[PDB]
Write an enzyme that holds these catalytic residues in place. Structure first.
Site, PDB file in Angstrom:
ATOM      1  CG  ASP A  35      83.773 -21.090 -20.808  1.00 55.82           C
ATOM      2  OD1 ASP A  35      83.663 -22.461 -20.658  1.00 55.82           O
ATOM      3  OD2 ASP A  35      82.683 -19.873 -20.876  1.00 55.82           O
ATOM      4  CB  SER A 199      81.282 -40.584 -23.099  1.00 58.46           C
ATOM      5  OG  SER A 199      81.413 -41.623 -22.090  1.00 58.46           O
TER       6      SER A 199
HETATM    7  C1  ZSS Z   1      78.085 -24.495 -22.152  1.00 57.21           C
HETATM    8  C2  ZSS Z   1      77.598 -23.824 -20.916  1.00 57.21           C
HETATM    9  S1  ZSS Z   1      78.050 -22.034 -20.415  1.00 57.21           S
HETATM   10  C3  ZSS Z   1      79.817 -22.052 -20.597  1.00 57.21           C
HETATM   11  N1  ZSS Z   1      80.789 -22.822 -20.576  1.00 57.21           N
HETATM   12  N2  ZSS Z   1      80.060 -20.779 -20.820  1.00 57.21           N
HETATM   13  C4  ZSS Z   1      76.446 -24.212 -20.137  1.00 57.21           C
HETATM   14  C5  ZSS Z   1      75.410 -24.108 -21.104  1.00 57.21           C
HETATM   15  C6  ZSS Z   1      74.125 -24.335 -20.409  1.00 57.21           C
HETATM   16  C7  ZSS Z   1      73.773 -24.647 -19.124  1.00 57.21           C
HETATM   17 CL1  ZSS Z   1      72.392 -24.908 -18.341  1.00 57.21          CL
HETATM   18  C8  ZSS Z   1      74.878 -25.066 -18.461  1.00 57.21           C
HETATM   19  C9  ZSS Z   1      76.334 -24.705 -18.777  1.00 57.21           C
HETATM   20  C1  ZSS Z   2      81.423 -19.533 -17.567  1.00 58.24           C
HETATM   21  C2  ZSS Z   2      80.352 -20.050 -16.278  1.00 58.24           C
HETATM   22  S1  ZSS Z   2      78.781 -20.632 -16.881  1.00 58.24           S
HETATM   23  C3  ZSS Z   2      78.926 -22.187 -16.188  1.00 58.24           C
HETATM   24  N1  ZSS Z   2      79.365 -22.278 -14.887  1.00 58.24           N
HETATM   25  N2  ZSS Z   2      78.323 -22.940 -16.780  1.00 58.24           N
HETATM   26  C4  ZSS Z   2      80.200 -18.885 -15.387  1.00 58.24           C
HETATM   27  C5  ZSS Z   2      81.288 -18.368 -14.433  1.00 58.24           C
HETATM   28  C6  ZSS Z   2      80.766 -17.450 -13.677  1.00 58.24           C
HETATM   29  C7  ZSS Z   2      79.432 -17.231 -13.431  1.00 58.24           C
HETATM   30 CL1  ZSS Z   2      79.223 -15.796 -12.091  1.00 58.24          CL
HETATM   31  C8  ZSS Z   2      78.747 -17.258 -14.265  1.00 58.24           C
HETATM   32  C9  ZSS Z   2      79.060 -18.385 -15.174  1.00 58.24           C
END
Ligand code: ZSS
Ligand code: ZSS
Ligand code: BR
Length: 330
Positions: A35, A199
């Site tokens: 991530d 971008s």
């Molecule tokens: C920065 C990511 S969270 C991650 N990548 N662990 C993120 C934040 C807020 C929203 Cl609403 C959607 C995605």
């Molecule tokens: C790191 C991401 S957050 C994202 N999708 N922006 C994540 C993974 C799995 C679950 Cl179940 C919840 C959040």
């Protein structure tokens, strides 16, 4: 040193990607979601509330001869999507694709929210944003990449995500066979702790390129591409029958549609996302309404170049003294 690990979609929609990670001695292999939008390495564990574990592989620090409790340290994280987890902290040996870090902070979950419990394929997260976002208290901890950086042949990692197929995370080298053309590098701001870049614009399908600055983050931990409402409206206007649904929570489109590509600018270069990458399938089993892979970032507060965008490119996360991002077609 270098490392190289295959990353695999968790499901048929590429909702996320998992990469095997070895933790402890003897190794305990867990499949983690790498991530670039967070900075905690946390795992389901023998300490996780039993009712909150449903099929995940757990880390058991008591079975690792190299595990040591990081005394007094706790962590708690809530991802902007609403999910969350928290616990205590061990240090242990962590290896990814042959690259080993000793003394890595491994955050052991005592609690996870329901969306984590409900996903049996993800055993934890491995954060690759900047260590300033790490949530461990009272002593903030470094990411796996930050700990590895000085040992790496080059202070970089690369993301090469596949479309409905496996891909690769490499550490410490750039595989020149993995992309076409050249890599275009672009400036990064680390001020918010993210791989934040600008971008240079976009195009929809075969349309003309619109030059406009779009500030956003390169986030392997986000599934979709979240862009300003003006851009997203211009995209979906080219899809007959597409609409934004308040009840579903975003743009949906008829599953019978063929979607146009979406191009984003990286400096003077262009990355083309094929239309099929933007199809996230029926909103519910058997429905003929399909969920779109390009959604508005309005209300998020930042634009997010998630997997939909990143999987169209070979992406270099350059962690030199002045970080930069690189994008190549592939
Ligand atoms: C920065 C990511 S969270 C991650 N990548 N662990 C993120 C934040 C807020 C929203 Cl609403 C959607 C995605
Ligand atoms: C790191 C991401 S957050 C994202 N999708 N922006 C994540 C993974 C799995 C679950 Cl179940 C919840 C959040
Ligand atoms: Br429906």
């Amino acid at each position: 040193s270098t490392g190289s690990a295959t990353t695999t979609p968790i499901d048929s929609l590429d909702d996320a990607y998992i990469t095997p990670v070895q933790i402890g001695t003897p190794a305990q292999t867990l499949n983690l979601d790498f991530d670039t939008g967070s900075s905690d390495l946390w795992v389901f564990s023998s300490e996780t509330t039993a009712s909150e574990v449903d099929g995940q592989t757990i880390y058991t620090p008591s079975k690792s001869t190299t595990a040591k409790l990081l005394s007094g340290a706790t962590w708690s994280i809530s991802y902007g999507d609403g999910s969350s987890s928290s616990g205590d902290v061990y240090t242990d040996t962590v290896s990814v694709g042959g690259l080993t870090v000793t003394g890595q902070a491994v955050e052991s979950a005592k609690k996870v929210s329901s969306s984590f419990t409900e996903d049996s394929t993800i055993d934890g997260l491995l954060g690759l944003a900047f260590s300033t976002l790490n949530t461990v208290s009272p002593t903030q901890q470094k990411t796996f990449f930050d700990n590895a950086k000085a040992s790496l042949d080059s202070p970089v990692f690369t993301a090469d995500l596949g479309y409905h197929a496996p891909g690769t995370y490499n550490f410490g080298f750039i595989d020149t066979t993995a992309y076409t053309g050249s890599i275009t590098y672009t400036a990064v701001s680390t001020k918010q702790g993210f791989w934040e870049w600008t971008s240079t614009g976009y195009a929809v399908g075969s349309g003309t390129f619109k030059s406009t600055s779009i500030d956003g983050i390169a986030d392997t931990g986000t599934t979709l591409l979240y862009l300003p409402a003006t851009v997203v409206s211009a995209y979906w206007a080219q899809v007959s029958g597409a609409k934004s649904s308040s009840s579903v929570g975003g743009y949906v489109f008829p599953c019978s549609a063929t979607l146009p590509s979406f191009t984003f600018g990286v400096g003077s270069a262009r990355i083309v996302i094929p239309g099929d990458y933007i199809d996230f399938g029926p909103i519910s089993t058997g429905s003929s309404s399909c969920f779109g892979g390009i959604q508005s970032s309005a209300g998020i507060g930042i634009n997010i170049f998630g997997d939909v965008a990143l999987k169209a490119a070979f992406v270099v996360f350059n962690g030199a003294t002045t970080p930069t991002l690189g994008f190549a077609s592939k």
